[PDB]
């Protein structure tokens, strides 16, 4: 499903209000793209689909602080 492998964002719902307030449903989908990330310790690319808000957090900690607690909640990368 459309979730992230760093931040835990899922699709939410809401409305689609018009100019006479005719409510109807839509979905809010998170931006998320495939991307490859180089590590140095295992010296190999790892590919994981992350949001654009996941790209900013990887720019904060760097790769391995976010890779380790992904393993420390028990996931495949």
């Amino acid at each position: 499903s459309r979730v992230c492998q760093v931040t835990g964002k899922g699709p939410v719902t809401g409305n689609n209000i018009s100019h006479a307030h005719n409510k109807t449903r839509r979905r809010f989908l998170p931006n998320l793209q495939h991307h490859r990330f180089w590590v140095e310790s295992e010296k190999r690319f790892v590919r994981l689909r992350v949001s654009a808000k996941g790209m900013r957090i990887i720019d904060k900690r760097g790769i391995e602080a976010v890779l380790a607690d992904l393993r420390a909640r028990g996931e495949k990368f």
Binding site: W38, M55, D59, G62
Partner: protein
């Protein structure tokens, strides 16, 4: 943002800190080893290797001086077709030209090239754009003779 480690780019320095786009540092400089993000944790170790940084800046240009005497020799004799006719009939090459500039030139060979000027026209010395840099390139001279 990042701390520069190379001197042969068009904005690089010895130890100057530059502010660049996020996609230019994420994708290109860091996964090769030409830069490092500025930190306040290992800064006692970067100051200890400043002597090792300037000895590395006195060796990369030293190997290039023993390298330019083998590239511009132009002794490569490519065996293409169309001996004495006039019409383009020779095997030009897009994958076999990387092995020809590596058996007697530089050994690196990887051609992900954006080009509408690839194959060459009627028999004569023309130019083929080959992998020479990482954000520019110019075309290398190719000698086309009979077979």
């Amino acid at each position: 943002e990042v701390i520069l480690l190379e001197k042969v780019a068009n904005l690089g320095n010895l130890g100057d800190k530059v502010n660049i786009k996020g996609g230019y540092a994420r994708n290109f400089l860091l996964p090769q080893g030409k830069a490092t993000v500025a930190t306040a944790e290992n800064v006692a170790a970067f100051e200890a290797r400043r002597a090792e940084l300037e000895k590395a800046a006195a060796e990369k240009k030293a190997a290039a001086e023993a390298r330019a005497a083998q590239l511009s020799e132009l002794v490569v004799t490519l065996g293409a077709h169309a001996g004495d006719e006039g019409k383009l009939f020779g095997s030009i090459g897009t994958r076999d030209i990387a092995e020809a500039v590596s058996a007697a030139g530089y050994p690196l060979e990887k051609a992900e090239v954006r080009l509408p000027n690839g194959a060459l026209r009627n028999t004569g010395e023309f130019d083929v754009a080959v992998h020479l840099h990482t954000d520019v390139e110019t075309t290398l001279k190719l000698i086309i003779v009979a077979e």
